[PDB]
Design a protein around this ligand. Structure first.
Ligand SMILES: Cn1nc(S(N)(=O)=O)s/c1=N\S(=O)(=O)c1ccc(C(C)(C)C)cc1
Ligand SMILES: Cn1nc(S(N)(=O)=O)s/c1=N\S(=O)(=O)c1ccc(C(C)(C)C)cc1
Ligand SMILES: [Zn+2]
Ligand SMILES: [Zn+2]
Lengths: 218, 226
């Protein structure tokens, strides 16, 4: 049972717990990393009001799953949202800028490739998109179509899962725009993960090629 | 033992030659691939060249290809990370595909920083004219010791467009984490130059078949070598 704690099952010792998990140690394109040097420079969305198929804290974090009806298109391939989960703190560093929460929209295409999306949260206003996840027969829909800023700066690169098995072949898009969140929610969420911090330390970057581009979500 | 003949030694089947080659099949950032989707960008003046025409420490054929070794007097500085040209070896045909474009030959400029980091600099060859940079090489297989010079600063183009991404070495152990600069511009090679090296590789095609892409982020940009 791998964990994020400072002991033996910790992030630094993940490869020597299971053997599929060597990649947490042997990989060169491991996520997360500190994004500070990048190059400035085809994304489509099928996000809609969706009922989470399930909501739960799992494998050390809180997570919401989804019916395979909501998609993202990249390179002419629909990737399917399974779930979106949370990390506190934010796993990814943006030019040494830190946020108290991020969220990962995890997707998969027909070939098999994963495409995940990360965005930051800054402390602030009460964020109404969070309640149906915090609320987990008659499941209330979640506003996937209203979650992200209409205008978004993203960073895109090739990386890894940030929790075991640290599988590679993941397309990372990380948004520079933060989603504001009131502090009562943050405290409430940090504790739905057992007041235990689920952030992987920055992994080695061996000059990951990153693009900065922009898009309109809706 | 590993070769391109689709027997026991075939190229995807590399993982089963050494278990050192497991990344050759299990790897996610594997080269070569079709350079067909990419990002147009600028020049932050990142990659710089202080190359010079230099005499090889040794010339020899190795591991299904021709290769030349070099003194650490020649370096590449990039983003504050200096690499040493270690050697130059060849592939016919070219392994990386440029917009689905096929070249009859490549050459790989291998670089190394103090670390384990790799930097390969690849450029193509098409049928045609005599390659004056190559002319000093086919005479280089007839000799040891004082090998004939390579006009290496006269090898590459004065002005250069490349494609850049993180990939792997293209031959076993198929090591990933290799910074690829792939040049679209071809150098020319005579059919005489074309035919003779293929026999120094036994007319045996030494190209790793195209690997799966996991949405590899590639940028297209340009620079000056000379
Ligand atoms: C363990 N892990 N880490 C992640 S991160 N933080 O890099 O986005 S996602 C994850 N596991 S997961 O989201 O439940 C998941 C992993 C793999 C799949 C498939 C589609 C089977 C490849 C589907 C869901
Ligand atoms: C295995 N291999 N693959 C290559 S390709 N086709 O991706 O450019 S070059 C190669 N082997 S090699 O050029 O002799 C070599 C030279 C130097 C090193 C280091 C260990 C970095 C000094 C490692 C391998
Ligand atoms: Zn995550
Ligand atoms: Zn090569």
């Amino acid at each position: 049972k791998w964990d994020y704690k400072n002991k033996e099952n910790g992030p630094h010792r993940w490869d020597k717990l299971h053997k599929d998990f060597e990649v947490c140690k042997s990989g060169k394109s491991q996520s997360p990393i500190n994004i500070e040097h990048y190059y400035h420079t085809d994304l489509q969305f099928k996000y809609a009001a969706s009922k989470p198929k399930a909501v739960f804290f799992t494998h050390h974090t809180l997570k919401a799953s989804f019916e395979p009806t909501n998609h993202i298109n990249y390179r002419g391939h629909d990737y399917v949202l399974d779930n979106v989960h949370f990390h506190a703190p934010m796993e990814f560093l943006i030019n040494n800028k830190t946020r108290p929460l991020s969220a990962h929209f995890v997707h998969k295409d027909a070939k098999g490739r994963l495409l995940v999306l990360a965005i930051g949260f800054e402390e602030g206003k009460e964020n109404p998109n969070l309640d149906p996840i915090l609320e987990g027969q008659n499941f209330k829909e979640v506003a996937l179509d209203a979650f992200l800023p209409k205008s978004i700066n993203y960073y895109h690169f090739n990386g890894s899962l940030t929790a075991p098995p640290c599988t590679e072949g993941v397309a990372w898009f990380v948004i520079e725009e933060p989603l504001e969140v009131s502090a009562k929610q943050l405290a409430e969420i940090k504790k739905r993960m057992k007041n235990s911090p689920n952030q992987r330390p920055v992994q080695p970057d061996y000059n990951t090629v990153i693009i900065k581009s922009s898009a309109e979500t809706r």
